[model samples]
Target: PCCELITNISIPDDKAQNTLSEIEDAISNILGKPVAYIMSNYDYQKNLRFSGSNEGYCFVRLTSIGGINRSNNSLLADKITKILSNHLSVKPRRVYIEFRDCFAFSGSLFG
Candidate 1:
């Protein structure tokens, strides 16, 4: 699984380092995948805007082969929201997460 976090919130260097690892671990746990297989990217300090405002907000994109589904999307959203909240002071109402189940990967298609 791969997770990408994009936000306009200016994170401190130390906090960004810690939060990135925390988010990676969180994704591993939620997706039932090993940490080695999980990849995460934090694209902070962006010019992101939501609801016609540039307030504190986050956009998360999670891509996996099969683990993401309707049954657990809410769970993923809630978990991600909490992470953004505690780490970046972003509110749940301002967080947007997109979970995608892809059919292909670096080697072969998901079977």
Candidate 2:
């Protein structure tokens, strides 16, 4: 599983690792995946905008081999929104998430 987060909010270097770690744990717990296999990436896009404004917005993309179906998506959305809100002061409504259950690694298709 992998989570790629792009946010307009700036996270200090000192807090970046913790932020990503929290997200990784959340994904692992919700998706029933091992934390060791989860990969987290963060991209701080200072100029990113949403809803025609740039007020603490985050765009998250999650890719996994499984456990990303319709039933699990809402749980993921809520958990991710809460994390972003607590860590970055981003509003839950301002966060957007995309889930991709199709991916490939090591020359093998998974999902």
Candidate 2 lDDT over 1-111, as tens digits, reads 778889998888768778888888777788787777677888999999998997789999987646677777788788888988998888888899998775346645554
Q: Please give the CA lDDT of all the candidate structures.
A: 0.79, 0.82
Worst 10 residues of 2 by lDDT: 102-111
Model 1: per-residue lDDT, tens digit, 2-21? 78888999888788878878
**Which ranges in model 2 have alpha carbons more than 4 Å from their true place?**
103-111
TM-score, one value per model: 0.79, 0.82
Pairs that collide, model 2: none
List all candidate RMSDs to the true structure: 4.4, 4.2
